[PDB]
Each structure stands twice: as structure tokens, then as C-alpha cells.
Copies of this chain bind each other. A is one copy, B any other.
Amino acid sequence: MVSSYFKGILLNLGLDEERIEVLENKGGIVEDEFEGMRYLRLKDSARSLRRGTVVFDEHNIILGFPHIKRVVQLENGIRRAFKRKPFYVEEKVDGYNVRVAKIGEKILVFTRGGFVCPFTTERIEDFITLDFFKDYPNMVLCGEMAGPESPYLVEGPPYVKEDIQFFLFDIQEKKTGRSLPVEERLKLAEEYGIPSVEVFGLYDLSRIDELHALIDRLTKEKREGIVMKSPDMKKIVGYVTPYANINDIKIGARIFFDLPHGYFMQRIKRLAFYLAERKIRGEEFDEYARALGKVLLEPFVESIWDISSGDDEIAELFTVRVKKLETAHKMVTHFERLRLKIHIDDIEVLDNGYWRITFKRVYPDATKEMRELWNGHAFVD
């Protein structure tokens, strides 16, 4: 299933032949290819190789990105993670994760799962310069692709008025995955003009009230929240605004069914702990309770009306800008590999020569469950 060439590299990475066989049989490791370049993708985690790790050769190993842990109680979350020591506070940008690296003569962009994204790879030079990889060919640029025209999200930061942007939040070494310290990363980002997430500054537990005021500002500005990082990047914790949790529910409630397990429950929990920590009461509490009920029910009810009055499926419409028409068809093929039911709904050439592609994603399973329930199907749950 996977070649002895790749298996040899895994053994060098300290992975035992027995586990290598188990991963091969279970499909935890799979061979893939982009523009003729063969690589191994880790669908599942294995020892020092996190999920999303990709292996092109002995040197070109791009470690998967670590899962960032979140706190729901900010003050006590800071104390447990950092005590009273300083930490950097960066904006948590609502987009999708990418790792950018130079493999051979090519600049490849990998999504969380380890797939080469045809959209972001085609357009990476619109967001960053390749000078960095001339001097640091063994380093991986880690950032968030976010904007109103995204292939993977229907929301984004408010200050991005069109298209999509790259926001660097880490620089990691190949093979080791070692993250550069924050100061060194920011120095490199400035030196090479790599766009960065906003760094609000250096904080500590003693400034918790300023951090609460920051969260309140970000909430009013419709931004997702913050990621707190020790200067050596060894301790990282995220915290999301009530807006992020509420808007997340609103977007998901249009589909409701067949979403990741606990999707809505997790956001309700984060709202409750925010209301408790900040001791929100009275009318301000009622606004949050009304807002929560609205985003849970209104999009859900509207979709029920949609599936009741016609045979159309629940859908999301989103647009991206590509340089070449052929890239849009590459994206459709890629969406299918990701098991996403997406087709091209509309096309228009922009005044700058770019193609604005409007994709339509449908949700047949959620549509089927919703329509069955509307038509009186009886269930024990």
C-alpha cells in the first residue's frame, strides 16, 4: 500500500516496523501526489508524527500542526498555564490553517489534514514573497488564510474587505516541528514582509482587566478572540469571544444535523462560563440569552421552511478568486476527495483579470434527516 521508500523514512523517524504495518493496514498512512510529486500523508497520529504530517523525503518532513488547547475561564486559565509570567497575546483569526514550505523547486501549501491545497498553492505568491525560502529553505511558514472569499469558511475577520489574506502565526522547522521564539518569528516576518496576525502585546495575569477589555473590544468588532503564547512558544492557549461562539452556532444551525459531535454544546458551554466569569446579569444577560436562542432556532427554522417548500438541498454559497479558470476545476476535484459535495454555481471575470468562482456546497444527509422529520417520520430519539 505504501512503498518501502517511505517505510524506510518512517523507521528512521523512530517508528517501529510493527506500528508501520498497523498504520498501513488501518490506512493511518497513505500515499498521495501533487503535480507528480509523491508524498506520504499521516491521516492518523503516530509517535512524534502528528496527524497532518507529510513526508516527501528524508529531509522534506512537514510536521502536522498541534491541536491548540482552549480555556473557557480566562483569568484562571491564565494562572494555570502561565502563573504570573509574561506571555504574548495574538489575535485568533477565524480562517483555515496552512503550512507553507519549499519542496524541491516548488512552494507547496498544506491544509490541516496534510493535503496540498490547489487554491492556496496557486495563489500563495499573492500573499507572501518567496525570499524567505531562499534564505530559510528548511523552515515552514504557519498561518491562517482568512477573508470573505474563502474556499473553506463562510465567515472571516471584518477588516478583510475582499478576497483572502494570509496571517502568519508560527514558523516551524522541518522534521522537528520546532517553533521559533515569538520575537525571532516577528523579526523574520518584518524582515521579509510576511503578513502577521496582530500581536496586541506582552501581558501577564496582573493585567487580567486589560485582557477582559480586549476581549470586549474584539467581541464588538466581531473578531474570534486571542491566542496566548509564552515567549519560547512552549505553552500556548486560546480563548474565543462570545461573538465567535454565537456566530459559530448561527452558521451551523442552518444545517444542524450531521455536524461534529458536541459542536453546539461546546459553544453553549463557552458562553455560560464567560457569563459566569464576568458576572453578567440582568438586561445584559437577557440579551445573551435571547441571542443564543435566536441563532439556535432562526437559521434552523428557516432551513425547515426551505426543505418543506421544495426538493432543494440545504446549501452554502461561497466565492473565491483564482488566477486561471482551470484552478476552479482542480478545486472541485479536491473538494470531492475531501468528501464535500461542491460544484461551480457561478463564474465572473473581475476587472483585474481574476476569476471570481462561486461554489455551492450541498448537505444531502442533513437535508434527508430534516425532510424526513418534517414529513412525519417517527423515531425513538
Contacts and interface: CB of A to CB of B under 8 A. Distances in A.
Interface of A: 67-73, 75-81, 237, 256, 262, 264-266, 268-269, 271-273, 275-276, 285-286, 288-294, 296-298, 300-301, 304-305, 308, 373-381
A261 to B, nearest CB: 8
A376 B77 contact: yes
A268 B267 CA distance: 15
Contacts of A81: 376, 378
Given A69-B378, A77-B376, A272 B301 contact: yes
Given A70-B378, A297-B288, A265 B264 contact: yes
A305 B290 CA distance: 21
- Would you call the interface of chain A mostly helix, strand, loop, or mixed? helix
Given A272-B300, A308-B276, A378 B80 contact: yes
Given A264-B264, A264-B268, 15 more contacts: A71-B378, A77-B377, A80-B376, A80-B377, A271-B297, A272-B297, A275-B297, A285-B297, A285-B298, A285-B301, A286-B290, A286-B294, A289-B294, A289-B297, A292-B296
> How many identical chains are in the complex?
2
29 contacts: A68-B380, A69-B378, A69-B380, A70-B379, A71-B377, A72-B373, A73-B373, A73-B374, A73-B376, A76-B374, A77-B377, A79-B376, A80-B376, A80-B377, A81-B378, A237-B378, A262-B381, A266-B381, A268-B300, A269-B373, A272-B300, A272-B301, A275-B301, A285-B298, A286-B290, A290-B293, A291-B293, A292-B293, A292-B296
A294 B282 CA distance: 12
B69 A374 contact: no
A174 B45 CA distance: 54
B380 A70 contact: yes
A375 B292 contact: no
Nearest to A68: B380
A256 B273 contact: no
A75 to B, nearest CB: 8
B373 A273 contact: yes
Contact of A80 (B80, B268, B285, B375): B375
Contact of A71 (B70, B271, B376): B376
Nearest to A305: B276
